[PDB]
């Protein structure tokens, strides 16, 4: 279940040019994981949400790992490849974290992957605030 979490990051709703524009991906969790509510959910996360999220994972897990994020534009442009890297970076980040039971347990992350509204409103909602 924990590693048995199934993730497609697709649908490169790459919000068109702004010189900083942010790709929004389907995140389909098809998950047999019982650490993920939905047997399938798709959310449509944007880069910013994830980076934060990634950080969140960082934040909820005190030393307890947090691998690399969604891919950096710090060398990236906005290239399909770059965004792919991001997509991938997430995929990876996510992949691993899912096959780490703990990082996969971040509730924000459950809500995040299993609800589209971004990390943010999930994150209020969770500390009952």
């Amino acid at each position: 279940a924990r590693p048995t979490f199934h993730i497609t990051v697709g649908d490169p709703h790459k919000v068109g040019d702004l010189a900083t524009s942010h790709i929004v991906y389907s995140v389909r969790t098809k998950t047999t994981s019982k650490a993920y509510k939905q047997p399938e959910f798709e959310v449509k996360r944007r880069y910013r949400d994830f980076l934060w999220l990634y950080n969140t994972l960082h934040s909820n897990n005190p030393g307890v790992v947090v691998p690399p994020p969604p891919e950096k534009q710090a060398v990236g442009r906005f290239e399909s490849n770059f965004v792919e890297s991001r997509r991938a970076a997430l995929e990876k980040m996510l992949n691993k974290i899912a096959a780490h039971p703990t990082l996969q347990l971040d509730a924000d992350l459950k809500l995040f992957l299993e609800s589209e509204s971004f990390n943010i409103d999930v994150k209020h909602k969770e500390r009952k605030e």
């Binding site: 939905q38 399938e40 959910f41 798709e42």
Partner: protein, 52 residues
């Protein structure tokens, strides 16, 4: 009792998704092929004007 209520929560979230997904399967397929034709019908009208 909470649990069954919860099970019915699952059915509706699942229906929401499946419905939304089908607009991109079937309706969008027709919306693309209809869009294609209006341009092409458009085009033999441009052709017709060349013949007149």
């Amino acid at each position: 009792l909470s649990g069954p209520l919860d099970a019915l929560s699952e059915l509706q979230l699942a229906i929401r998704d499946v419905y939304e997904r089908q607009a991109q399967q079937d309706v969008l397929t027709f919306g693309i092929i209809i869009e294609e034709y209006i341009r092409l019908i458009g085009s033999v009208k441009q052709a017709f004007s060349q013949r007149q």
